[PDB]
Structures are given as C-alpha cells and as structure tokens.
From a paper:
Therefore, we engineered a disulfide bond in SARS-CoV-2 SUD-core based on SARS-CoV SUD-core; the resulting mutant containing double mutations L516C-Y647C was denoted SARS-CoV-2 SUD-core-CC. The crystals of SARS-CoV-2 SUD-core-CC belonged to the space group of P321 and the best crystals diffracted the X rays to 1.35 Å resolution. After the screening of SUD-binding compounds (detailed in bellow sections), the SUD crystals co-crystallized with the hit compound 4 diffracted to the highest resolution 1.35 Å, thus was used for in depth analysis. Our highest-resolution dataset (1.35 Å resolution) was obtained by co-crystalizing SARS-CoV-2 SUD-core-CC with Comp.4, suggesting that it interacted with SUD during crystallization. SUD-core-CC comprises tandem SUD-N and SUD-M macrodomains connected by a flexible loop region. We clearly observed the engineered disulfide bond between L561C and Y647C, tethering SUD-N and SUD-M together. We superimposed SARS-CoV-2 SUD-core-CC and SARS-CoV SUD-core, and 257 Cα atoms aligned with a Dali Z-score of 24.1, and a root mean square deviation (RMSD) of 2.6 Å.
SUD contains three subdomains; there are two macrodomains, Mac2 and Mac3, that are followed by a frataxin-like Domain Preceding Ubl2 and PL2pro (DPUP).
Author numbering: 417 to 487, 491 to 540, 550 to 674
Write the structure that this text describes.
Amino acid sequence: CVEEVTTTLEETKFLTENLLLYIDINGNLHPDSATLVSDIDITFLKKDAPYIVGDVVQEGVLTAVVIPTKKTTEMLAKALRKVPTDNYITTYPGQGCNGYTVEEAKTVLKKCKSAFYILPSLGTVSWNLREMLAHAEETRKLMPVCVETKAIVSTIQRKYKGIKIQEGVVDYGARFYFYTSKTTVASLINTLNDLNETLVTMPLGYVTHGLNLEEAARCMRSLKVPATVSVSSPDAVTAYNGYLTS
C-alpha cells in the first residue's frame, strides 16, 4: 500500500507518472511538494483559492490535496480520503509546519485507498545577536535575518560599515539571507534548502510570521540543511528541544 523508495523523483517515474502534492488553504505548496513541480504549470493550484481542508485539484500528472495542521490525525485522514484512488509518487503527508510525525503520516496512509511511493528524505544554543553575528562571520554559515526587525538591521549596519542591506542574499562582512514577513515561511525554507548552506538562525517564522516557538519548531523540520538554531534563553533551549523530541 505504502512503499518507501530509494530513488529520486525522476528515478521513480517508471512506477507511475502521477504525483500527489500537499497544499494549504491558499493553494500554496508544502515545502516537501514544492520541489516536485519543476517545468510544470501550477497556475491551477492557486487559481481556485481559497479552499477548505480536503479539497483536491488536479491537472495533468499532478494531484494536490489541502491538508490540515495538527492540533488532528482524524482530520488528516479525512483529507486524504478525498484523493482519487490511484498510484502516486508522494511525500509523507502533514510534515513540517503542519505538525504531524512520520508515524502519524504512516498511520493515515495505512488506510490504503491508493498506492503510494514515498520519496526519500547541530546543537541548539541560546546566543545573543552579537554572538550570532560573530559566529556567522567566522564560520561562513548563512544567517537569515528579518529585515523588518530594525534592531537587528541597525546592529548589522553598525558592525559592517558600508553594508547595503536589501532582500535576498547579501555577503558583506558575514553572509546573510534578508527576508521579510511578507513572504511565506514555506518560500523562505525552500530558498534556504536550495542554497544548500549550513545556517546559523533563530527559529524561522517565530514572531515575524506570528508563530509561537512550537509552531516555528514544527516548520523548521522542513529544512534540509544543517542549522545551528539559537533561541531566546536557556529555558527556551529546553522547550525547543522538547518540541523536537515529540
């Protein structure tokens, strides 16, 4: 019913051409699905938004289902039951920001309406901004920075006289990825995954995108690069790690 394959997307197409993607209420692709869509028009995903959980859109080789965020496992199962019975290449549903575990996803796919081929898929610290900047500078790790956070921008401008801060990668003094809250956490995670650099970072989405620390920890599971994650205090180190022990 569910088979974990050892192959890349292209190397799995011999089994089936059909891909099952996960989207949110607005038709935005989950980070795990966002990389499976190259050279395909995806206008249809957002064209009919907003959706409700369980809605399914299809075009060509692609099927996409709107999935929930865990509070429930029953709601994730109910959403997957709407996918037409077929054979699909996919990823485990509900990972990353949505908050489900791999075992929860397996439980849901165990119900076996369709057949699924599942593609294959650093210490936490409490460092202040001065410490993070110094660490980035010497290690050459990429440091995401929200440019709306003026206190950070001001610090960077004082440390690296002459830096011209703008959105995107800026490599001046240290290597920064400057972003704003006006793009999604998913898009930021996908960009950082594509850059394929080790990070030194605060939890992504925390505060800037309205996420609490647990929600941000869930999203951080979608990173496919190593990351030194720096949290607000020693007590937050324990909390954050606990969110990941789950």
